[PDB]
Amino acid sequence: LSTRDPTVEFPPDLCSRVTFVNFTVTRSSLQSQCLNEVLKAERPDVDEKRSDLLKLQGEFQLRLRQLEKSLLQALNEVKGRILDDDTIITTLENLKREAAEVTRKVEETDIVMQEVETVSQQYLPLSTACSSIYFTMESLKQIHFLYQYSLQFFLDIYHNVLYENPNLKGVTDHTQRLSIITKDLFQVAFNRVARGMLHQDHITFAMLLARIKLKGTVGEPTYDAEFQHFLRGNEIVLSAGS
Amino acid sequence: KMQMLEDEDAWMRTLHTTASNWLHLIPQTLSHLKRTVENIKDPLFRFFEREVKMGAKLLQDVRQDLADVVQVCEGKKKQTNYLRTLINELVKGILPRSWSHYTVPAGMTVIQWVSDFSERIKQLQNISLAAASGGAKELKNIHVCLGGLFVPEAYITATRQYVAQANSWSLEELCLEVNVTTSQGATLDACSFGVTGLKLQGATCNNNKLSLSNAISTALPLTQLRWVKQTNTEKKASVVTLPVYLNFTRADLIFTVDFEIATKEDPRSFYERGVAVLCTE
Amino acid sequence: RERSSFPRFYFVGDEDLLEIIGNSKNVAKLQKHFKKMFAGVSSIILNEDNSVVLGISSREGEEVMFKTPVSITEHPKINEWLTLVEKEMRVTLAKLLAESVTEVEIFGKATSIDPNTYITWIDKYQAQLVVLSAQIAWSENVETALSSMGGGGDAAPLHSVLSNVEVTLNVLADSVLMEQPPLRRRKLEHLITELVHQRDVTRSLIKSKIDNAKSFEWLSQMRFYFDPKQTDVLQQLSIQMANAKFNYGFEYLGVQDKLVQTPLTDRCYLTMTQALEARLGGSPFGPAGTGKTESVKALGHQLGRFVLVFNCDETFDFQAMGRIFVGLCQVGAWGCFDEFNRLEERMLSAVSQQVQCIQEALREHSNPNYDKTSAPITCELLNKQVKVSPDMAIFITMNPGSNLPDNLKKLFRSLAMTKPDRQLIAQVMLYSQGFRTAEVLANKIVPFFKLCDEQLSSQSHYDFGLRALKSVLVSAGNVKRERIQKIKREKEERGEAVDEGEIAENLPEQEILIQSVCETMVPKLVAEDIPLLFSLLSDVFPGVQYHRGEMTALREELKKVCQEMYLTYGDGEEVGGMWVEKVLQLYQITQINHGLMMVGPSGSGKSMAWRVLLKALERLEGVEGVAHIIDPKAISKDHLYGTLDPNTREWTDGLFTHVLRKIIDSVRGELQKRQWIVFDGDVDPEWVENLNSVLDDNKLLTLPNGERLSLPPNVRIMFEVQDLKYATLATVSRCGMVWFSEDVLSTDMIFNNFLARLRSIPLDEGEDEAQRRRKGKEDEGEEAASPMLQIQRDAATIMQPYFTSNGLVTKALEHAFQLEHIMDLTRLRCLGSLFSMLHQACRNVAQYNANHPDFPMQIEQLERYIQRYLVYAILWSLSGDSRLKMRAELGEYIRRITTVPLPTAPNIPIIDYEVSISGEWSPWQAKVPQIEVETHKVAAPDVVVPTLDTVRHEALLYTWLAEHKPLVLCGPPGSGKTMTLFSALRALPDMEVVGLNFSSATTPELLLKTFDHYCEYRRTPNGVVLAPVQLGKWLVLFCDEINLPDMDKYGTQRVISFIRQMVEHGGFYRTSDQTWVKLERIQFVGACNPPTDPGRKPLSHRFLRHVPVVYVDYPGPASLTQIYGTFNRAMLRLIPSLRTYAEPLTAAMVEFYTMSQERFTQDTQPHYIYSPREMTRWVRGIFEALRPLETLPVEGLIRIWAHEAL
Amino acid sequence: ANGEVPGLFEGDEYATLMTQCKEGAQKEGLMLDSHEELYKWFTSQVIRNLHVVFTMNPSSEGLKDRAATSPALFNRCVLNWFGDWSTEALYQVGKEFTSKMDLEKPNYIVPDYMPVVYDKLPQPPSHREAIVNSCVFVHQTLHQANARLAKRGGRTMAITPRHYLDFINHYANLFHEKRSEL
Ligand SMILES: Nc1ncnc2c1ncn2[C@@H]1O[C@H](COP(=O)(O)OP(=O)(O)OP(=O)(O)O)[C@@H](O)[C@H]1O
Ligand SMILES: Nc1ncnc2c1ncn2[C@@H]1O[C@H](COP(=O)(O)OP(=O)(O)OP(=O)(O)O)[C@@H](O)[C@H]1O
Ligand SMILES: Nc1ncnc2c1ncn2[C@@H]1O[C@H](COP(=O)(O)OP(=O)(O)O)[C@@H](O)[C@H]1O
């Protein structure tokens, strides 16, 4: 079974007979996807290191087992049909190499993941910035009925900022690369969103992206109370006679 | 209003606090005007009774809905689906369809709506207590803000009817002359009524004679609207007709005023200046 | 081909064209389409042999002569002779206009014109041609004036033209005080309306001091350049508006209303004619009551084009809008689209697409590159080619209050209609009707209507628009003419000279206008607004009084009929002044209009005003009155207004159509009579679209078959509608209103009607003496006609002080007003229940004195019994709907405000007491039957164990079945209401019961079915009688749930309106035979839950007006203990060793039940409700346990009891 | 209310069902002659034989024509709260569904405090008892999370014993296919 709209209210009688399988993207899902597509494209050494330690599961397990079927057991029933060239030692060393490889990967399973985690700690402000950027640019609907956008569109923004950006050519240092990625993300997002807005709202959208970077940056206070009083002072009660 | 679609990365308690503030600021009761057979012959009393009735009924409805909101926010009552939509509208900052019971600027904030509601309800309480203390006679004497009334068009009609009854004149022999007096508490004529709450646009008043100004607007002092007998007097070339819009968007009209050109300037300059009169900014 | 030959079969249907082409010799059949076919043509004039078209007949009796009449015989082709008819109609219009402008040349070139010659010209020449000749004369003399000026600045010719128009208008103002036929009067009105506008134009030119022939100061006005020497008939007259150079379309307008050329209409003509020259469209917007579509109509009249306004206020026809477009383009027509924004999405976009295509096809003529030498103009209307005429126009009117359509924001030059010159329109209509002081009274009446719409309390039946002002001014002109006739007759009868101008000079015009305003608007005014409106009108019109039109003859006839019909009367401001004024206003509106609305709520007296008016007019004029109270919601739409057989075509007669067919045939000759048809019950706009043509100026019952039924003034269609809350604005504006406020049918009125009808109506006589009222009038020598009538008169005399203005019954009724009952309270319901109870008290005295033949009871016993029954009856009639708590508090209020002696027990409810046959009190518990049921059936009692509640309820069901009144039993479910109904109904042997339950989707096709099965039809000399098949056997039809059937689309349910008409009239109009019947041996009764319960629709006050209501609560502690003690005492006989445990078993059971019900209530969970139904389930369970068991100890009994409780 | 509905058997249905009812009357052995008494006998047979019971959702329906179903129905129908499964029934339905699989392993140790929701759990717990107690606490925590989400105002839905039985089937099936994978 399937549906189209995500906001329904099924009755309890139908609800007991069927379970729900949700495809919608929330902040945690978008953040997980952001980590996924930033840890597999930015630093190729990090990509290969993470892909190496993520392959200790069923792939390598089946690759071992398919000939472990023959390697595990040897006891009985001589037949005189193996000494054609005495080259079966290379045949079993073909799996001895794989066994040593998987044993070495089991022994070294925390240093690479620790490096990945310390890289991803720097990527946490990037991912919360990306989430706030998409949620505001999708919440743009309350300004004007033409202001409606797509998550596929946002993923295309992110894809173009990462892959097809000439600003990333010939740059290797990683703090600078992170600054380049966040600045180019903000630039391409603002440009392609403001390709289809009125002039009266480009300033609003730029102010929103700037507030998002202010609240997602590090080393300076986010000015949350100042921003909140500045904005919502018009909507809160203001005392007469003061 | 940006952050209330998907920026969920607690509205009940904040709505409870602001509803307590609304209950603090909105007055509790609006007493209806007591009607006598002697007082009912006065159109001023008729109009003021009708306005007091409508304002008190709207006061009771808004107090009941506010009581429902605060009882639900206190955990004592529950609100249904349409009132959940009402909660969503109050959170998002849009005035719902169940509150536009009078003339108001379009698409404005609910907090300012409640604030000007409190101001006009205070004005209605003042005029109702004045009516209860004095009668229909003091209804002429008390200065009434034009923009704070629900229907100031009916107010100026009521003053027209009052002077018509006072001087036993037909309502085809009366016309309105506008007297903006900088003096406060002037001696009101039997045909003159005290009205505040006006503010001029694109012009300034100087002894009932306008002059062009570069300011945004000017604070109009105590205005006196006088109904004098419409004589067959030729209209001067230095007389300018201005609308009195109720609000800034200027979609509906209240009445027209006639002021005097002071210096050399063309009244075409006033017209292209767009000199209007506003009751609310 | 048919379109190319005759493009005028198109606005009327395919079946109409088929009967036209198959019935070519049926000229009377073919003449039915002309009213909608032309602008003002009603029919045509033909020969006796129908071989020569003599002329054209109008709606207002105009018969145009033909200077070259058409002959039909030599042109046998139908479309060919029709086209020749319209072509020669154009030719004769041109030639008659040529002769008329030839003579009006002399008319306008003479300083003094003979009024008789002027009237002769008006009578000879048609309205259209006379106003056109006035136009041509004025425009040509001012053209000669300007050409003689030639820039010389000579003001003499303009001054002479102005003086000529002034003296002609003086002739009109002196000759307008005469008396004329309607057609000649309308021609005079149109002529003066246009000539004052030409006077305005000449004053404007002399104030502008214009001196040029081609100056725009003259080009911006209504110009009529005429060339009588032109060969082409259409191009003889030219209508040139500034840039535009148009030509008048010479089609017979007929007698069409001409709207005044105000400056707003002047700008409207400017914009739309300039748009038409530019080949764009026009699209005025604005609010209602401003003049958009009728200004379009006025321009179409003044140019001479077929104007047919296509209104689409929820009355669209999507298949015919394209045909409308093709007809407009093919013939040349102007179609105004009033309120185009009120159209739904898909068909709005479709019609916008087609009108955009038409507008672009018109725009193809605008450019000069597209030469007119070879112009095959084409356009598409659903895959077809249509040539667009170069003179058609489409005017898409908007009504914001939303903007112009998206496809129509550029192709239509829009104009803003916001505020018309109502002062000018009032001034021109007063001056045109004949009022000498038009301007002052006009400028007094124009602030008046805005003043009323401001200051008056808002209600739906009010109206103060400019259409209302026009109708009020028409009424004022008619009253002015009538007053002129009366003054002339009085001066002729007296000895004095006669001079119309002299008597018109000393004649109160303000009094005439104030009287017309009051006569048109005051009867629609609620009694709240009357003194404020009189002070309003005295402020606007100072020193002007309104005198009521006095009719002492109808006053005397009304008083005689009122004394005949057991009523009261008043000569104004007394007890009856309001009702007398209301019925006289009803007379005035029936004389003015041919059908009106009575719009009082339930409990008002509208039908009694109607009937008393009919009888008073009978005794006045000797004109025999017929009544047809046709109920619209009593039969479905097709049965009400007739229907067609889909195959083998036969017009079966519906109710209203059969009545109209009978009255038009008039075998008895009812044209001399006065037939009145009343639609009782409230207004529903789903049976008014057929009434619109009947009540409009056509006065025809249009049918798909083609039969036309005219409406003589013998027919007056009144309505008795409770409220117009669901009524259309067309019905609001069409008919007069007499609003019956609830404070005109006073409590004193109700008391006096009851007392008089009791004092002089014999009770048991029935159908014999109802028809014997024709024989004799008073029955002298029969003071004691029956001993029960002596009892009735004595009881009425005794209870006279208790039915006063400030009486005990009045105080009790006004206290029960501020009490609360589950059903919707009605004063007439309470009083009718009280009166039926007093009727049964008299019946009880009659039966007691019949069963005591030695002596009847004395005056002391009579007074005590009737006083006690009166307290009993007011209690059960007012607090009988409510719950026990406030029923008891109304008993306490009755105790504290009464003067009748009461039972002496303080802590016992007074309602728990029975009135004895003697003059004392006795509780129902003293005589309740303490039955002992059999053990064979105890858990399912087909007979009720009697208790206090059961004996009270069965006694009063007997009481309100004796007078055959319907009775409803509301209360919480499971309170034994259907059971008590069954027991009390089957106890008496005089009546049968047919138990029926109404579902949510019931229609009284079911009631007709149960009448067909359970009764039969018998014909009598007195009429038609429906009676049960078993002779001497009353039939009480039963209703389990009255509330259950669903409401209609407008909040009025069929099933309850049927029973309303039964209890009101006493019969129904059949569907198969369409005849009046009378119910001779039928009653009605029903049961209900309170309407706060979910599936319970609250009932109409229209039906609740009649029926008394009783609240059946849960039995309570003593009743429960009594009945279930009887149940267990007769139930514990299965085991003989346990005779002494029934009372503790019942006491424990009912105490546990009461505490469980008090604890668990439905406010927490919806299913926490308890009733004796579950108690009898409990008793059934205990019996089913104890039956197949030989013996059981007391411990086992308590175990079974607690098990069933759990 | 009456063992019958006025309007079901009017017309030729009356004749056919009355002749068949008379045939049944002489089949069982009581003599009825008049049509009214035969109709009464058929009504008595219906009111003895036919019983109608309901299967419907709990007190949260507010959209159907029933919705908050009529108090007349709530009074005329004897009421029985079917309710939700308790912890003890959850323990039983967890115990005698997973017993088929080879869940036995005696190396399990008991703690000083063993978190138990099924208040009559056999102490010391076994492998099966720990499994079933955990399976029950999963359902209990899902109820608690649903209550928390509905208190916060999010989109929630009712969870069912059908859901719990599905979970037990899922656990036993997954253990089966993983032991079958081994
Ligand atoms: N002249 C009168 N004097 C006293 N009572 C009157 C008089 N005319 C009418 N009534 C009262 O009016 C009652 C019924 O009048 P009527 O049926 O016309 O009123 P209604 O409530 O408007 O009903 P409907 O519109 O259904 O006919 C009578 O019972 C009577 O008591
Ligand atoms: N006071 C009572 N005495 C005897 N039986 C009672 C009493 N109250 C209720 N009952 C029981 O009520 C049942 C029938 O209910 P009732 O007489 O209210 O009719 P109904 O058609 O169910 O009512 P409703 O108008 O609520 O639809 C019977 O089984 C009868 O035993
Ligand atoms: N110049 C006028 N002369 C006479 N009657 C007018 C004039 N202008 C407006 N009216 C009245 O105003 C009313 C407006 O109604 P109408 O034009 O039919 O539709 P709408 O209300 O949509 O404009 C008309 O009934 C008409 O009687």
CSV table of C-alpha atoms and ligand atoms in Angstrom, one decimal, chain C residues 567-568 579 602-608 680 720 745 749-750 753 1102 1105, ligand 1:
chain,number,residue,atom,x,y,z
C,567,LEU,CA,-63.4,37.5,19.1
C,568,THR,CA,-62.6,41.0,20.4
C,579,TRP,CA,-54.8,43.8,14.8
C,602,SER,CA,-46.1,31.4,15.2
C,603,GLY,CA,-48.7,32.7,17.5
C,604,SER,CA,-49.6,35.8,15.6
C,605,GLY,CA,-53.1,35.6,14.0
C,606,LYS,CA,-52.2,36.1,10.3
C,607,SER,CA,-54.7,33.5,9.1
C,608,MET,CA,-57.4,34.9,11.3
C,680,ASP,CA,-49.6,28.2,4.7
C,720,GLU,CA,-48.6,32.6,5.6
C,745,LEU,CA,-52.1,38.5,19.4
C,749,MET,CA,-57.1,38.0,22.9
C,750,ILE,CA,-56.3,34.3,23.5
C,753,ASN,CA,-61.4,33.7,22.2
C,1102,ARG,CA,-45.4,25.8,13.5
C,1105,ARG,CA,-48.0,25.6,18.3
E,1,LIG,N1,-59.7,38.8,16.9
E,1,LIG,C1,-59.1,37.8,17.7
E,1,LIG,N2,-59.3,37.9,19.1
E,1,LIG,C2,-58.8,37.0,19.9
E,1,LIG,N3,-58.0,36.0,19.5
E,1,LIG,C3,-57.8,35.9,18.2
E,1,LIG,C4,-58.3,36.8,17.3
E,1,LIG,N4,-57.9,36.4,16.0
E,1,LIG,C5,-57.1,35.4,16.2
E,1,LIG,N5,-57.0,35.0,17.5
E,1,LIG,C6,-56.3,33.9,18.1
E,1,LIG,O1,-55.5,33.4,17.0
E,1,LIG,C7,-55.4,31.9,17.2
E,1,LIG,C8,-55.0,31.3,15.9
E,1,LIG,O2,-54.8,32.3,14.9
E,1,LIG,P1,-53.9,32.0,13.6
E,1,LIG,O3,-54.0,30.5,13.3
E,1,LIG,O4,-54.3,32.9,12.5
E,1,LIG,O5,-52.5,32.3,14.1
E,1,LIG,P2,-51.0,31.9,13.7
E,1,LIG,O6,-50.3,31.4,14.9
E,1,LIG,O7,-50.3,33.0,13.0
E,1,LIG,O8,-51.2,30.6,12.8
E,1,LIG,P3,-51.1,30.2,11.3
E,1,LIG,O9,-50.1,31.1,10.5
E,1,LIG,O10,-50.6,28.7,11.3
E,1,LIG,O11,-52.5,30.2,10.7
E,1,LIG,C9,-56.8,31.5,17.7
E,1,LIG,O12,-56.7,30.4,18.5
E,1,LIG,C10,-57.2,32.8,18.6
E,1,LIG,O13,-57.0,32.5,20.0
